[PDB]
Amino acid sequence: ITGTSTVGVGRGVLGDQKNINTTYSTYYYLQDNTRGDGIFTYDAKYRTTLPGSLWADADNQFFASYDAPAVDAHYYAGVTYDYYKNVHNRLSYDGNNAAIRSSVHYSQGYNNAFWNGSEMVYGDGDGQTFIPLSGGIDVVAHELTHAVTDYTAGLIYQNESGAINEAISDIFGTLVEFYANKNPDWEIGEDVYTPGISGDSLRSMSDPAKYGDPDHYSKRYTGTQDNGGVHINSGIINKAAYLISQGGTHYGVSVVGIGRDKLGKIFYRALTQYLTPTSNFSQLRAAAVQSATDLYGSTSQEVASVKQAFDAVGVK
Ligand SMILES: Cc1ccc2c(c1)[C@H](CC(C)C)NC(=O)[C@H](CC(C)C)NP(=O)([O-])CCO2
Ligand SMILES: [Ca+2]
Ligand SMILES: [Ca+2]
Ligand SMILES: [Ca+2]
Ligand SMILES: [Ca+2]
Ligand SMILES: [Zn+2]
């Protein structure tokens, strides 16, 4: 759409009010021209055909409940774009300011979100297992990060590489949640998962085993489900990243924390400079070590913590 940039206001899934960037041209659309080639949010109107229709509103106020998921998808995508640009100097997912598109209200009672190779898609949840998925900033950031990974390392979606791909999305979605200082934690999806139950989440990076995911290489899943357990084994890497950041003793191995910022610098460099489509856990370790070496010196504490963390999860 061609029109005038403006700002509207609405309420998100969690009932919070926020301003969002809109474009005016007869209607007000969810099209943000202030970021790269734009952020665009579409209505899939409970169907599965994508992308659906660019979101149009008559008055620039988005307080209807059908509006909520769009508000959040639109706003959280803008925050995530900002994180990459401000923190890593990366312009959108392809590094060349590609337009970011999302569709909401996908299907009926769909309990998931995903990147389909060209855009993000969010289900509204069935209202018991989930509420509209775009209400979780860690969820939106996990989706957009899959785009980042596809454009860079290109980790294939299966076995070890696929688990690395999933951990990357969890890690950066968690860093984005902290960046936005939105009640940050090391849990994934807490904000949209099981509305009736407090305190739970889909996955835990601080203690993956809490939900049954592995937290040590000896406990990895070797079967065929989930493409070889990409959503299961990511637990081992998630645990490693949590230790590098926060520190701790795991399975008797002690790691001194180096903090989030460095965790993000080291993983972003590994991802964009050393990882390849078929990289395995052991290769991820070499990459993280080399990245930290590059950034901080081979005899740095940083390098030391990266090594300890992987040793603690059993990855040699
Ligand atoms: C077993 C499995 C297959 C495909 C999936 C997912 C799991 C998993 C289902 C969630 C846990 C309900 N999806 C994800 O972890 C993320 C969404 C969460 C961050 C809320 N979606 P993607 O990994 O991008 C797509 C595949 O989802
Ligand atoms: Ca309106
Ligand atoms: Ca949180
Ligand atoms: Ca979280
Ligand atoms: Ca819950
Ligand atoms: Zn994922």
Give the resolution to one decimal, in Å.
1.8
Eight-state DSSP code of residue 134: G
What was the experiment behind these coordinates? X-ray
On whether the CB atoms of residues 113 and 106 are closer than 8 A, the answer is: no
Report which ligand 1 atom has the smallest distance to the Cα of 138.
19
**Which residues, including other chains, have CB under 8 Å from residue 215's CB and lie 6 or more apart?**
207, 208, 209, 235, 236, 239, 250, 313
CATH code 1.10.390.10 for 155-315: yes
| Ligand 1 mutation pick, 110, 112, 172, max ligand atoms within 8 A of CB | 112
Q: Is the CB of 113 under 6 A from ligand 1?
A: yes
On whether the CB atoms of residues 69 and 135 are closer than 8 A, the answer is: yes
Buried b / exposed e over 153-168, threshold 16 CB at 10 Å, is bebbbbbbbbbbbbbb
Determine the distance separating the centroid of ligand 4 and the alpha carbon of 183, expressed in angstroms: 8
Report which ligand 1 atom has the smallest distance to the Cα of 146.
24
Alpha carbons 272 and 154: distance in angstroms, whole number: 10
Q: Is the CB of 141 under 6 A from ligand 1?
A: no
CATH topology of domain 6-154: Elastase; domain 1 (3.10.170)
Q: Is the CB of 262 under 6 A from ligand 1?
A: no
Ligand nearest to the CA of 56: 2
Token readout for 267 is 């993983």
Q: Show the CA angle centred on residue 7, arms to residues 5 and 13, nearest 5°.
A: 130
CATH 1.10.390.10 residue ranges for the chain: 155-315
Alpha carbons 10 and 23: distance in angstroms, whole number: 15
- Using CA positions, which residue lies closest to atom 15 of ligand 1? 231
Residue type, 89: N
On whether the CB atoms of residues 13 and 69 are closer than 8 A, the answer is: yes
For residue 245, the number of C-alpha atoms closer than 13 Å in the C-beta half-sphere is: 22
Three-state secondary structure call for residue 58: coil
CATH 3.10.170.10 residue ranges for the chain: 6-154
Residues identified as active-site: 143, 231
On whether the CB atoms of residues 5 and 127 are closer than 8 A, the answer is: no
Q: Is the CB of 150 under 6 A from ligand 1?
A: no
Question: What residue spans of the chain are helical by DSSP H?
Answer: 68-88, 137-151, 159-179, 225-229, 234-246, 260-269, 281-296, 301-312
Alpha carbons 228 and 38: distance in angstroms, whole number: 36
